Design an enzyme around this catalytic site. Sequence first.
Site, short mmCIF file in Angstrom:
data_model
loop_
_atom_site.label_atom_id
_atom_site.label_comp_id
_atom_site.label_asym_id
_atom_site.label_seq_id
_atom_site.Cartn_x
_atom_site.Cartn_y
_atom_site.Cartn_z
N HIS A 1 -31.00 -15.36 -21.18
CA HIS A 1 -31.43 -16.38 -20.24
C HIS A 1 -32.82 -16.83 -20.64
CE1 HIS A 1 -28.12 -15.28 -17.43
NE2 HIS A 1 -28.23 -14.16 -18.10
N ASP B 1 -32.33 -20.46 -12.93
CA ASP B 1 -31.11 -19.90 -13.45
C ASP B 1 -30.12 -19.72 -12.31
OD1 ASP B 1 -29.12 -18.56 -14.98
OD2 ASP B 1 -30.65 -17.49 -16.14
#
Length: 408
Positions: A15, A114
Amino acid sequence: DTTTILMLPWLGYGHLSAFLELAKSLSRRNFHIYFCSTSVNLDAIKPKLPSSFSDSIQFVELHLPSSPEFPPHLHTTNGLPPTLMPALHQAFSMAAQHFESILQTLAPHLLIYDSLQPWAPRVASSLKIPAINFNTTGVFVISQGLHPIHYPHSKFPFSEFVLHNHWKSTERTRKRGEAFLYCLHASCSVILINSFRELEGKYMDYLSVLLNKKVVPVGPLVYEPNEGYSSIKNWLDKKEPSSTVFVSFGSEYFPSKEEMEEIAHGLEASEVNFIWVVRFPQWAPQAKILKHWSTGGFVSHCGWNSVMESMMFGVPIIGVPMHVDQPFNAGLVEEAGVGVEAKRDPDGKIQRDEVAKLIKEVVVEKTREDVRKKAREMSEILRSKGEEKFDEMVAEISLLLKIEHHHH
């Protein structure tokens, strides 16, 4: 004055890598980036940010509650014992009040979060700051989950892929509620995602319809390397073309001792060259290794970054999935023709001989070349795509911020 974006990745290396690549492009497009994660993650991604971005991308530390036995250098999913996973989620949950102190102080014009912070879009709505969602993984796995939600009865339209579900705790209770999460603003009306249409065009178009959102692709987001390699280059440079495979399994899944044993046998039975230095709960130049002539094989767990890197470079994918998204990503690779999947035996475990059959058939022996054609062809289009990659994304961000400009 200039425009500012707060970027909040989930606490994982993949990520972080994806978000930093999107952060770099936004810097080149005259945005000020507030890159926000825990101190341990900021340190682990700091090497990838060159010194030319020091004035346009600031690292903003998010404080998880720490204690002598769960200190900050563990506030990440990288290398973390699985039995400490519950605490990390709990500590992250509790960081919501500090994150709000970050938003109030920084007063960014946009929040790109995210897909794993439930409190990030909820905190940004409270301060009237627009927030867009960025998914660092593929669309194909997301549409498989939302298909039974509307069509329990219809078969999956575009794909003929099937899975064993041998994979089969209370996270799902939270996951289904997102599917029904409403949206009355333009900030959530569009989502950015780390995929490209040549690979998942139909699944983005299908997912756009289920979510009633605009799916703006900004992928693939692969990081190109700028010693370790010197020693490894010796192997690659010496050996003849296409005789080796790389074994990657990631820093969040530690394969079981039996599983490692069965996999290892695939390598020995395959009689193939191998470069593997795996990790245990508490590194190697994967990208450079994938980018050599001797390299013609990748035995990957099929995380999204590993799947994107190979397609960008052009190395065929030997898939051995064993975690949350891997089997789907591995199904997508075979459908695309850019790789083959090793179908783990009708039993729960991985077939020791099944892996060996494929590695030789693809790398040492050109038994399957239909795949090699697809690997180079795919990699040509990826590299062909250039700065238009962020064109659609920049347009939507521009439009969104202008709409909110009136709502004041």
